[PDB]
Symmetry: none
Subunit: 113 residues, 2 copies
C-alpha cells in the first residue's frame, strides 16, 4: 500500500542548493508555498531545508484535508528540468524532526503582500 | 552545526533487528552512500537504540556534510531517515575506536 495522507508532507526538487543564486530564495519559496496553501486549506508549519541536495521543503497543514489540498496544488510544478514531488510524513517522524510542529495550530500567511 | 560526525535516526526499529545482517547491511548502506561523497572512517549501528540510531564519522567535515545533505530527508526502509550532526567529542567518547580510525571504510 501507499502511506496514508497525514497533516505533514515533504516536498522535493523545490530547489537545488548548488544553483540557488538569489538572496532570500528560501523565504520566497516559503512565501510561494504558503500563498499556494492559502488558496486551499492553509498551512501551520513549513520548513525549507536549504542544505538538502534534493531540495526538500517540509510542510504541515491544519488538517489532513488541508494537507491533501496543498500537496495536490504543489506537486505539479517543475524546476530546472526536475519535477517537484510530495511525500507524506507520519506525525511521530515529522514531530520528531519538527517538535514545535506538534502544537502549532495557527494558519500561516505569506510575508509578501 | 556540521561536523565530521552525525547520527542517523529512524534507520531501523526492534522489528528490523529480527532479520540476520540487518545491522551489517545498514552499516554497508551508509558506507556506500558515504563513498559516493567523501567516504567514512567509522560507523556504529546501535542495536540497543529505540530510535534506530546509526552513528557515522567521515574523514572530513566536507565529507560528512555531503553525506548528511544526501542522507537527511532520504527515505530508507519506508521510513524517512533524519541526520543530526554529532559533536566530534561526543562521538569519540561514545565511540573510542573512531578517534584513531583513519582507514576509509568499505562495504563488507
Ligand atoms: Cl517515517
Amino acid at each position: 500500500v501507499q502511506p496514508l495522507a497525514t497533516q505533514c508532507f515533504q516536498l522535493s526538487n523545490m530547489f537545488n542548493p548548488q544553483t540557488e543564486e538569489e538572496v532570500g530564495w528560501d523565504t520566497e519559496i516559503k512565501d510561494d508555498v504558503i500563498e499556494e496553501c492559502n488558496k486551499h486549506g492553509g498551512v501551520i508549519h513549513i520548513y525549507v531545508d536549504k542544505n538538502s541536495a534534493q531540495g526538500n521543503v517540509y510542510v504541515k497543514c491544519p488538517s489532513i484535508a488541508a494537507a491533501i489540498a496543498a500537496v495536490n496544488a504543489l506537486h505539479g510544478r517543475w524546476f530546472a528540468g526536475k519535477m517537484i514531488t510530495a511525500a507524506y510524513v507520519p506525525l511521530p517522524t515529522y514531530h520528531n524532526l519538527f517538535p514545535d510542529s506538534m502544537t502549532a495550530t495557527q494558519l500561516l500567511v505569506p510575508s509578501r503582500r
